[PDB]
Amino acid sequence: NLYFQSMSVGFIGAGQLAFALAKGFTAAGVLAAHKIMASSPDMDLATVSALRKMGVKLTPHNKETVQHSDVLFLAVKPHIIPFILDEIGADIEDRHIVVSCAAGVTISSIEKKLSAFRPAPRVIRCMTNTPVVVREGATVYATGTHAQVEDGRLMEQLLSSVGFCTEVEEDLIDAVTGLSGSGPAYAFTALDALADGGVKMGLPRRLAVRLGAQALLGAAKMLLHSEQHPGQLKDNVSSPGGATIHALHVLESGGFRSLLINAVEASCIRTRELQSMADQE
Template structure:
């Protein structure tokens, strides 16, 4: 899997971006594009049947509409940010106004590139991406795959844009279901771990607010150590485990409870479910 950090291009000045669907991910991506200076707020347009969603995204200074065709007509890059079961309907609706200038970026879980290409005019440029909810705090983990007609420059462009909301990698589409199982669903695993660690702190006498803050910061710090040190997580774990100390006693309990096996099973289950959704 190639890292987007090796591919950088300058986003064209006055590039226009559209979102069909103005939910939380569209809002997060818009905020990242704007705050990074890559895309001007007035060059972004979003559509959504839910007026409340349009109200939220309008607070970023972007334009809104109820007309999906208008989004396509006004945008160079169009992000498909609707629920997977609505993708076919939306693409059939906008297909008549799609031109060769348009690039479609889909964040719809489980919807394969081939299906999107079939619903749009021949040779439409399509890229599929799996981001995750930490995009809301510009800490996403995103992986994208190129469609049959996407150009090399399209991938560079998307990589640079997605880097404004976190880290971004390019991979084969066949990997995206596993990406969904790991990083797409992964925030939920991390939230459950933080909650459980905080519960443990409360059980042992810590105030709830302090326990939760310590648990969350510990998870954040550990993640940064993995990313910034380049060391294997097992090596970093060993560095915390002193002989006959507190941490190795805790790790023994986690091993007996099947902690690592449960996480592996969770990623597997989410991956298999993603495959089902896309079949």
């Protein structure tokens, strides 16, 4: 029974993440689509067309998003953030809460830009993922220097309506990016391959996709609802000498676990490397 009646939300950038969050928020019923505005220099993108059909207000001008909004999501690529902040920094008012969703971009770098125009900008950094579109996102956030206590509580209330949300120290966010930010892509890759395996063994593709995705969804839910270690839940599936333990062995023989560790590491490291380039630039 949550609803932010006095909240106007804006998105700078009207791409995949802006669509995903706007769809999640509106499906959650916590925001009316007409209370959301999004801006982009390309009003002929597929994401803009979808936002328009939801009822979201669209404009090419970032200043109009700022003037309309109370909560301002920065949903542009990381290298575009500094250009955006210089463009609308003079338009940031006392009432604004600036929420950066950009991978890698630090609170410090955002506050430095905006503070040149008006002291004490209220900044929150978040990392989320596309499953907010089905209200099953994984979101962490960190509060900036001038964010009020109620700013973080409000953002946690808003982002909890589209999935899991918790506050973290900012120095964890690049690692979260490599785990749950990039995580859905790992899962889509795994599901494509599991379906290929189903097809190889005789299943129609449509059924193999549905079963593989259902298997992954159910296993993730079991772990989230259980206090047992993932190894114990695994032991419950595998009968002695059975089909599952035979399959687990061939995963182990290929270093399956190490590949997923490799992936989280590589995404985290790249996130740190890109920001180190941005700060040197």
